[PDB]
Ligand binder design. Structure first.
Ligand SMILES: OC[C@H]1O[C@@](CO)(O[C@H]2O[C@H](CO)[C@@H](O)[C@H](O)[C@H]2O)[C@@H](O)[C@@H]1O
Ligand SMILES: [K+]
Length: 263
């Protein structure tokens, strides 16, 4: 069936010129709204959530892991390193790297998390351990953001990512302390006000992670606490046909607005 909300999302998509993917889980009733929910999309930096979460999971059996220092060398700096570049020839702890990756989208910090997990496949292995059979991370940053149409590397589906984000932030994929830390980090994101958040009523609370890459890829994944409603999880992925396309955070905001109006 096609719902009214799906109809509106299809109209948004057609006016956007790109390809939109949406998955909502409403934890009031566990119902779901999906638009291209089983198509693959390039995650770009939304994959940082899974990497940070995997390190949180490791910290459940090492109480001191988040205070472990990691050396930052000049050679480690990549294309976007607003926090790590201050620490070159110095160190950052795994907590500092997780915070920098999630809240500032620091790519050097992401690469340190990936290295702590043994490479991109270690992030995929964590996804599998928590029941996500779809997610794959294949490369480090920044090349995980190439976002080439049809390329399966560094992709997931909206359905899979919404389920996983729910298990991580509202469910029991992580220990209680670790879940709370992940939620605190997401809620402190600096990069999200133009994306899902822009489509929701101001009274609602959001924790989110954005992503962007080539092909005008513009993504956001969020856990939302509506005014007076049980929490939602919302994934919005958007990608375009031309490599040099501009970002379209407004399309994500419009998707979120449609979802909110449909509740
Ligand atoms: O966007 C983060 C970071 O990436 C760079 C290239 O390393 O720019 C890319 O992203 C920009 C924003 O989407 C695009 O405008 C640009 O064309 C693309 O190369 C850095 O300039 C930027 O800080
Ligand atoms: K871009």
């Amino acid at each position: 069936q096609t719902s009214a909300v799906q109809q509106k999302l299809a109209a948004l998509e057609k006016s956007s010129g790109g390809r939109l993917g949406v998955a909502l889980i409403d934890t009031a009733d566990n119902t779901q709204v999906l638009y291209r929910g089983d198509e693959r999309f390039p995650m770009c930096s939304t994959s940082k959530v899974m990497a940070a979460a995997a390190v949180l999971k490791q910290s459940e059996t090492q109480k001191q892991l988040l205070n472990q220092p990691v050396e930052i060398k000049p050679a480690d700096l990549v294309n976007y390193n607003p926090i790590a570049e201050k620490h070159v020839n110095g160190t950052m702890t795994l907590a500092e790297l997780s915070a920098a990756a999630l809240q500032y989208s620091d790519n050097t910090a992401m690469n340190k998390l990936i290295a702590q997990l043994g490479g991109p496949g270690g992030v995929t292995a964590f996804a599998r351990a928590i029941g996500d059979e779809t997610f794959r991370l294949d490369r480090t940053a920044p090349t995980l953001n190439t976002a080439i149409p049809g390329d399966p590397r560094d992709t997931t589906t909206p359905r899979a990512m919404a389920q996983t984000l729910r298990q991580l932030t509202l469910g029991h994929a992580l220990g209680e302390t670790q879940r709370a830390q992940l939620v605190t980090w997401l809620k402190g994101n600096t990069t999200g006000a133009a994306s899902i958040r822009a489509g929701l009523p101001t009274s609602w609370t959001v924790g989110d992670k954005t992503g962007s890459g080539d092909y005008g890829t513009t993504n956001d994944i969020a856990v939302i606490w509506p005014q007076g409603r049980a929490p939602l999880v919302l994934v919005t992925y958007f990608t375009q046909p031309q490599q040099n396309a501009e970002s379209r955070r407004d399309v994500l905001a419009s998707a979120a607005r449609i979802i909110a109006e449909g509740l």
